[PDB]
Write a protein that binds this ligand. Structure first.
Ligand SMILES: Cc1cc2nc3c(=O)[nH]c(=O)nc-3n(C[C@H](O)[C@H](O)[C@H](O)COP(=O)(O)OP(=O)(O)OC[C@H]3O[C@@H](n4cnc5c(N)ncnc54)[C@H](O)[C@@H]3O)c2cc1C
Ligand SMILES: O=C(c1ccc(OCCN2CCCCC2)cc1)c1c(-c2ccc(O)cc2)sc2cc(O)ccc12
Ligand SMILES: O=C(c1ccc(OCCN2CCCCC2)cc1)c1c(-c2ccc(O)cc2)sc2cc(O)ccc12
Ligand SMILES: Nc1nc2c(c(=O)[nH]1)N[C@H]1C(S)=C(S)[C@@H](COP(=O)(O)O)O[C@H]1N2
Ligand SMILES: Nc1nc2c(c(=O)[nH]1)N[C@H]1C(S)=C(S)[C@@H](COP(=O)(O)O)O[C@H]1N2
Ligand code: MOS
Ligand code: MOS
Ligand code: FES
Ligand code: FES
Lengths: 1295, 99, 50, 50
């Protein structure tokens, strides 16, 4: 009946009869009402829930601070400890901590959802290293993810703690050592008492025991043999959350000294099972410094793989003993330990026992495993002998914080006087259910020498022993087979080199071209430069004004939808989704779930009666599935319960029986094959392509595939629906891009006029087009439940169900036939576009239309035919995305240009200049354009980036390196901006002036992090001639501005700015006579005089929209208002033996017109570029042949992290030009920079061609260009040597 | 509007005004309340003139909207307010007015 | 522009819900801001008449 | 079903404010003693003019 006592932000927290299942993250937000700490993914991978844990050790008299992810911490493990959140280090009503002030003022926030995690990771680092290096700060952020900023401004804020810019660094608060938080004195007293008592907590579902003595821990291990021993909960935690595991009894000890031991012996090193991985990293890093290389072989290999293991938070939570026992097949440490003669020190009531850490232990043979009543105390890792060498290798989707596809540990021992292999141990991870060893191959290699024929024999032996079925889980089978022998080759080169160093007489030397295979791709030197431009001083237009919510982002005070306080008696709604891609729902059983605790209601399609459908565009479609399902993740049931936990528990016991249906369509080609119904065609024609193909020198046929993309907004789908209690009024608070649409679908579902339903949006934590259609579906179903039961209803999706429900960017297939001259002119181009639409074709026709109107990019194709189709599949329906078809259509065009370049013997850059638009030219849709800035962006990027010089240096590197290659590429940009009609571009605003002079402004646009609200206050400040501090904005609401269009299409700030300007001018006109009589007066004087003279101080602003038109039958029109121009150059280096690659440098020039806010505009270029970079390289969605999205292990989705950012990044804004049509001659940058990411794609493509051309192979690389695709294209003796399975003889993991 | 409902039925009288001026049944109109966030600088609800003066402001906003919509009303006199409102949107005519 | 007042309906006033109402609101708002909490104030009939 | 001001639902963690009023028609406030009231259950704050 113990009490749980710990501290949060200096305040004491006591809980009586605490539920042991309580986790820290929901406890902070709901019970303590501290909503700064966010939910991001719930698996410990994104860092949005980063907090600081502080403990006091009474034996050593020292206070330790360590970061942690609150989503994995059970609060029962916090007894006597101190938590610190973002709110605990500062706020706007106390003091702003320097970390908060700088990340905000350096423009390190956009949507702000990731900021509290970034702050806590930086703050915790500074509490441990007050005078740090940049490497220490970037390592601390390795497990912190951002979708908006591109990480550059956050590194800038990190740099200021180390020793024409966008921030005044000299005005920052210095780091005050007297202001830092004090460890709660009471916790120090409790630790001094050194209690021996075992703490006990419990509920009806779980028993929790926390022994504090070794004797008690052994007693509970004996009485509850099957109970897990929780340390950091980073293996058990994710398994109970995502795999339905449940433990009725938990043993979680508290700082047992015997498990924290660190013994420096004569023969080796003994590390306790309770040490965290971060502590082991530090212990080993100290040992390798004070001991000679001869003995520290095992410790260097372990240090290598501890550097890339997850992030700083997980490393500070996870234990060494937990790592060994959990026996993950993808473990990075267990393959190294398996080859190092390590032994495990076990303990129980019976006594002590020592077992080897071998292959049988890692395979969980009960003969070589722990006994049920045994614990692991410590592990012994021996010193290495002379002539003993150990190496570790790994390859994953991303350099850091990603589970390995294959890893390995290898050890070899030579005889002093023979050079003969005496011992050899090789183990691999990620190639089976457990870590395996090649004990048979190794034993056969015993007695040989280290030379060519040993390596060739070893390869064939290894491949036979460590075999993989073509159906092996995780997929990437041919990649895994190649990596297995590629690592062996690297180990061969490593050992061959040190032997030649130690024994020059008996060994040959490495070939010069082979030596860089030993150097890994690594860099932490993140450099960058920015270039922009330079009216009264009061006028903020053109100034780098910080995001209005920047500081509130950094303090956790920004309210997102789920941060809203608990509404009285609100319920929670969760969905049961489809587990089949195309099947018949034969029956649904709700009997069990309905009877479960807290369940209020469960709704199927028949409970929604006639409001289960809604006409979004051309046809009415279901909210909930009826008799059939047409993709996984389709909504089927909606569970309504008193609490979120009760809702998810009941939803799991809803029972649905399926009967699969043919056909099962998953790919575009399957969709074309199985389709025979009429499909609406979209077509562009310019010139005469049939005539032109008879004059060209050459003809070329090619095709490229391009995968999709998850939005990965850091804030998942979130909404709160509150009925008023009168006249069926409904208030809908939802994270959406389109409040008008939420209002329509909610009112329709409730059979109400629109004046009864209002939608309010203050801010959105990222959207990128993925918070529109299905957001309304969920909002309509949630509102139906709220009205039915007269209760507020909240609905927030977890990351997993969010990715299954929402859908992502349209995958593409592009087929082209190109007729070109021998010098590069493409006189004829016959192009075909196919989009994978998913189960619904709602927004797939619009992206096809935009793809055709944008596929020309920067090139004048005199004879061009372009056609496009949207293809239905049995996959989640795909939505809009940043770019709106341009990132797909332009890559397909750039792929065709790259293929034409190969035929002509010219670099792709030369073919680009010869096909580029002229200064005055014409588009395929017969719109006249001015491309002066297109050419200028190209020239300035060539000069700024020193392309020609670096081109020679890359060719020189590739001529001197065989297993490493560098690549270089530059692509141009023409991103046109414009909607389909004038009505689609209209915007409105509402401005009040109160009698004290202050101003309230609101408009129809939505803040997603792009800073539209900041830009509107900048407009009000100029038009009304008042400082921005006199203006304020609350949010966006259908109750104040009606009939607002979707926040999207790169025009949000442009059009709403014109509406805000319109209202400000109306007010200034009314006040001109009062202005004249008192020119020296304040706005308080002018407002009061206006009231006294009966002059209205409220005005509606309105803009009718740009004139835009497109006649799709004729294929002509004036659809676009202006064009964003740009150029991007990127350089990379690839590892031909593994597929790894490093982004070395990127240079970007952008035509932005006159930037209203260069800080925000540059931040939009950086974020778009990084988002496109992930689209073309590392972001990959894996589906099974049954249509199931794979999300565990190496199938986890990876967005770019800090390690993926280019080490060098130069961005320059083109000098301004006049554009009297747009607001202040500005241009909308939001979507343009995404395509610039493919400069990395074609830089990798360049490097792959260099290796292929040198190896004599005479290339279509699909997107995303993953390490799997890079490695397999670099064909060598290993690619040819691997076994291959007959296609169709096995069911693959992926398609 | 700026007036306060304290039992005298001002809100009832305002929707009566909207019903006349816009030629629509009162069930097509709705009012939620009074807020400084929607109507600023409103005088006290007192002096026997609350319905008088706010009625003239509501009448002013209705006439501004009916002015904007007269060309659309002319071409489709038999249409509903749903038809007229959507056509106004399609022709980029503002449907919010301050009285 | 930082302070908004919302009124749906009043259960009778007859002039007696102006000046003193603002004083009570100003004092209540001071407490609410001082403690970061929402604050409710309702008067009983006796103290109301005083 | 008509919502008057006090009919609004309990908002999360809201407090309540009540007033101590004068019992004299014309006098001077010699002293105010809050020691007992401040220590009583639930009391968050007591505010005087200063
Ligand atoms: C986001 C994320 C990223 C990751 N990335 C990587 C990665 O890149 N590479 C990698 O190799 N791993 C990775 N991991 C896995 C991680 O290294 C392990 O989950 C961790 O080391 C397990 O230690 P723990 O203390 O969290 O164990 P727990 O989850 O607390 O326990 C796991 C198991 O160990 C048992 N156990 C623990 N201590 C003892 C003991 N003394 N005696 C007996 N049994 C014991 C428990 O009973 C339980 O069965 C990642 C995990 C996460 C969540
Ligand atoms: O016994 C040898 C050895 C034997 C013959 C060698 O000949 C080198 C090639 N030779 C050059 C002169 C003309 C004939 C060919 C070299 C090393 C040892 C080694 C070796 C290395 C590579 C290889 O492919 C085979 C063996 S390594 C070694 C270590 C020792 O302590 C003792 C002997 C050795
Ligand atoms: O902007 C639209 C939209 C606009 C007009 C439409 O017209 C449909 C035809 N209908 C005819 C009768 C009058 C009303 C319109 C459809 C969608 C988008 C949507 C919408 C808006 C309102 C609504 O009630 C339902 C759906 S959903 C959507 C997703 C996008 O990615 C882009 C635009 C959109
Ligand atoms: N931080 C952030 N930036 C963003 C987005 C977002 O969700 N978050 N959305 C992008 C998309 S899809 C569009 S269309 C534009 C919309 O705003 P704008 O028109 O003012 O650029 O912002 C872009 N930039
Ligand atoms: N039911 C009701 N009627 C009422 C009042 C009231 O509080 N309740 N106030 C009176 C007062 S003080 C005035 S000044 C007027 C204000 O509204 P009117 O201007 O529309 O008459 O309503 C009068 N009638
Ligand atoms: O245009 Mo951005 O909303 S897909
Ligand atoms: O005129 Mo009534 O507000 S006293
Ligand atoms: S790391 Fe916990 S929510 Fe992402
Ligand atoms: S600011 Fe980092 S996720 Fe948006």
């Amino acid at each position: 009946a113990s009490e749980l006592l710990f501290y949060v932000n200096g305040r004491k927290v006591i809980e009586k009869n605490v539920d042991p299942e309580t986790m820290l993250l929901p406890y902070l937000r709901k019970k303590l009402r501290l909503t700064g700490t966010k939910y991001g993914c719930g698996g410990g991978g994104c860092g949005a829930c980063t907090v600081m844990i502080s403990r006091y050790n009474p034996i050593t008299k020292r206070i330790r601070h360590h970061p942690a992810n609150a989503c994995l911490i059970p609060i029962c493990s916090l007894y006597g400890a101190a938590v610190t959140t973002v709110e605990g280090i500062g706020s706007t009503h106390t003091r702003i901590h320097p970390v908060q002030e700088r990340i905000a003022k350096c423009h390190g926030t956009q949507c702000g959802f990731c900021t509290p995690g970034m702050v806590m990771s930086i703050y915790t680092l500074l509490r441990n290293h007050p005078e740090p290096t940049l490497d220490q700060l970037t390592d601390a952020l390795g497990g912190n993810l951002c979708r908006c900023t591109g990480y550059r401004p956050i590194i800038d804020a990190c740099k200021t703690f180390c020793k024409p810019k966008l921030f005044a660094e000299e005005e920052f608060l210095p780091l005050d050592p007297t202001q830092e938080l004090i460890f709660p004195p009471e916790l120090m007293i409790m630790a001094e008492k050194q209690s021996q008592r075992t703490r006990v907590f419990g509920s009806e579902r779980m028993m929790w025991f926390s022994p504090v003595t070794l004797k008690e821990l052994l007693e509970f291990k004996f009485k509850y043999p099957q109970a897990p021993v929780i340390m950091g909960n980073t293996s058990v935690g994710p398994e109970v959350k995502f795999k339905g595991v449940f433990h009725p009894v938990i043993i979680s000890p508290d700082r047992i000294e015997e498990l924290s031991v660190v013994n420096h012996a004569y023969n080796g090193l003994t590390l306790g099972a309770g040490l965290s991985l971060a502590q082991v990293k530090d212990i080993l890093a100290d040992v390798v410094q004070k001991l000679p290389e001869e003995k520290t072989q095992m410790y260097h290999a372990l240090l290598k793989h501890l550097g890339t293991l997850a992030g700083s938070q997980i490393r500070n939570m996870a234990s060494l003993g937990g790592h060994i026992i959990s026996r993950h097949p993808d473990s990075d440490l267990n393959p190294i330990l398996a080859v190092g003669n390590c032994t495990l020190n076990l303990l129980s009531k019976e006594g002590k026992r020592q077992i080897p850490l071998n292959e049988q232990f890692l395979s969980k043979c009960p003969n070589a495993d722990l006994k049920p009543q045994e614990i692991l105390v410590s592990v012994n890792i021996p010193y290495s002998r002379k002539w003993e060498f150990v190496s570790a290798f790994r390859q994953a989707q991303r350099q850091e914080n990603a589970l390995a596809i294959v890893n390995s540990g290898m050890r070899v021992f030579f005889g002093e006087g023979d050079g003969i292999i005496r011992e050899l141990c090789i183990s691999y991870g990620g190639v089976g259910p457990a870590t395996i060893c090649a004990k048979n191959s190794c034993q056969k290699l015993i007695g040989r020498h280290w030379n060519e024929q040993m390596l060739d024999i070893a390869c064939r032996l290894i491949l036979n022993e460590v075999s993989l079925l073509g159906s092996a889980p995780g997929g990437k089978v041919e990649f895994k087979r190649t990596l297995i022998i590629s690592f062996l080759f690297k180990f061969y080169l490593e050992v061959s080199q040190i032997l030649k160093k130690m024994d020059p007489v008996h060994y040959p030397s490495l070939a010069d071209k082979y030596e860089s295979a030993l150097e890994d791709l690594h860099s932490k030197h993140h450099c960058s430069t920015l270039k922009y431009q330079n009216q009264h001083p009061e006028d903020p237009i053109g100034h780098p004004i910080m995001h209005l919510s920047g500081v509130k982002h950094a303090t956790g005070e920004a309210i997102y939808c789920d941060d809203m306080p608990l509404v009285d008696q609100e319920l929670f709604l969760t969905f049961v989704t489809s587990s089949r891609a195309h099947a018949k729902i034969v029956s649904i059983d709700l009997s069990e779930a309905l009877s479960m605790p807290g369940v209020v209601d469960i709704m199927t399609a028949e409970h929604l009666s006639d409001v289960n459908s809604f006409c979004f565009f051309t046809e009415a479609e279901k909210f909930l599935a009826t008799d059939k399902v047409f993709c996984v993740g389709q909504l089927v049931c909606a569970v309504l319960a008193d609490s979120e936990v009760q809702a998810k528990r009941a939803a799991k016991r809803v029972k649905i029986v399926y009967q699969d249906l043919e056909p099962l369509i998953l790919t575009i080609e399957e969709s074309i094959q199985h389709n025979s119904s009429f499909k609406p065609e979209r077509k562009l024609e310019y010139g005469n392509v049939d005539e032109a193909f008879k004059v060209v020198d050459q003809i070329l046929e090619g095709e490229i595939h391009m995968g999709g993309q998850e939005h990965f907004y850091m804030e998942t789908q979130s909404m709160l629906v509150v009925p008023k209690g009168e006249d069926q009024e409904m208030d809908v608070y939802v994270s959406t891009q389109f409040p008008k649409y939420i209002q329509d679908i909610v009112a329709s579902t409730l059979k109400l006029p629109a004046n009864k339903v209002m939608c309010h949006v203050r801010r959105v934590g990222g959207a990128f087009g993925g918070k529109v259609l299905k957001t309304g579906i969920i909002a309509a179903v949630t509102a139906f439940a709220a009205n039915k039961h007269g209760r507020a209803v909240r609905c927030v999706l977890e990351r997993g169900e969010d990715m299954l429900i929402t859908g992502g960017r349209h995958p593409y297939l592009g087929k082209y036939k190109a007729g070109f001259m021998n010098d590069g002119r493409i006189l004829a181009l016959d192009m075909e576009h196919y989009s994978n639409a998913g189960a619904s074709l709602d927004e797939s026709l619009f992206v096809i239309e935009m793809g055709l109107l944008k596929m020309d990019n920067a090139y004048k194709f005199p004879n061009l035919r372009c056609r496009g189709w949207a293809c239905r599949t049995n996959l989640p329906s795909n939505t809009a995305f940043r770019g709106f078809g341009f990132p797909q259509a332009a890559l397909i065009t750039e792929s065709c240009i790259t293929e034409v370049a190969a035929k002509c013997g010219l670099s792709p850059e030369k073919v680009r200049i010869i096909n580029m638009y002229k200064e005055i030219d014409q588009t395929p849709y017969k719109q006249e354009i001015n491309a002066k800035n297109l050419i200028q962006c190209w020239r300035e990027c060539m000069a700024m980036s020193s392309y020609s010089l670096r081109k020679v240096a890359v060719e020189k590197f590739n001529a001197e390196n065989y297993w490493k290659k560098k690549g270089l590429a530059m692509v141009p940009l023409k991103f046109p901006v414009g909607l389909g009609s004038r009505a689609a571009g209209q915007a409105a605003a509402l401005v009040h002036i109160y009698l004290d002079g202050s101003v309230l402004v609101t408009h129809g646009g939505i803040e997603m992090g792009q800073g539209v609200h900041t830009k509107m206050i900048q407009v009000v400040s100029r038009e009304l001639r008042m400082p921005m501090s006199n203006v304020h904005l609350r949010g966006t609401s259908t109750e104040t501005v009606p009939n607002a269009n979707i926040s999207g299409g790169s025009v949000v700030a442009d059009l709403n700015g014109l509406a805000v300007k319109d209202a400000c001018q109306t007010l200034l006109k009314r006040l001109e006579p009062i202005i004249s009589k008192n020119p020296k007066g304040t706005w308080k004087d002018w407002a009061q005089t206006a009231f006294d003279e009966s002059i209205n101080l409220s005005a509606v602003g309105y803009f009718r929209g740009y004139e835009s038109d497109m006649n799709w039958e004729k294929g002509e029109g004036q659809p676009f208002e202006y064009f964003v121009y740009g150029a991007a150059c990127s350089e990379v280096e690839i590892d031909c033996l593994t597929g790894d690659h490093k982004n070395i440098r990127t240079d970007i020039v952008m035509d932005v017109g006159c930037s209203i806010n260069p800080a925000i505009d540059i931040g939009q270029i950086e974020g778009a570029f990084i988002q496109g970079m992930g689209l073309y390289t590392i972001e990959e969605l894996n589906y099974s042949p049954q249509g199931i999205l794979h999300t565990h292990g190496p199938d986890q989705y990876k967005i770019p992290a800090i390690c993926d950012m280019p080490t060098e990044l130069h961005i320059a804004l083109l000098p301004p030009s006049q554009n009297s049509n747009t607001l202040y001659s500005s241009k909308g940058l939001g979507e343009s920079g995404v395509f610039l990411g493919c400069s990395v794609f074609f830089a990798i493509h360049d490097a792959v061609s260099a290796a292929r051309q040198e190896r004599g192979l005479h290339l279509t690389l699909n997107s995303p260009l993953t390490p799997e695709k890079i490695r397999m294209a670099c064909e060598d003796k290993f690619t040819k040597m691997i076994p291959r399975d007959e296609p169709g003889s096995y069911v693959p993991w992926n398609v």
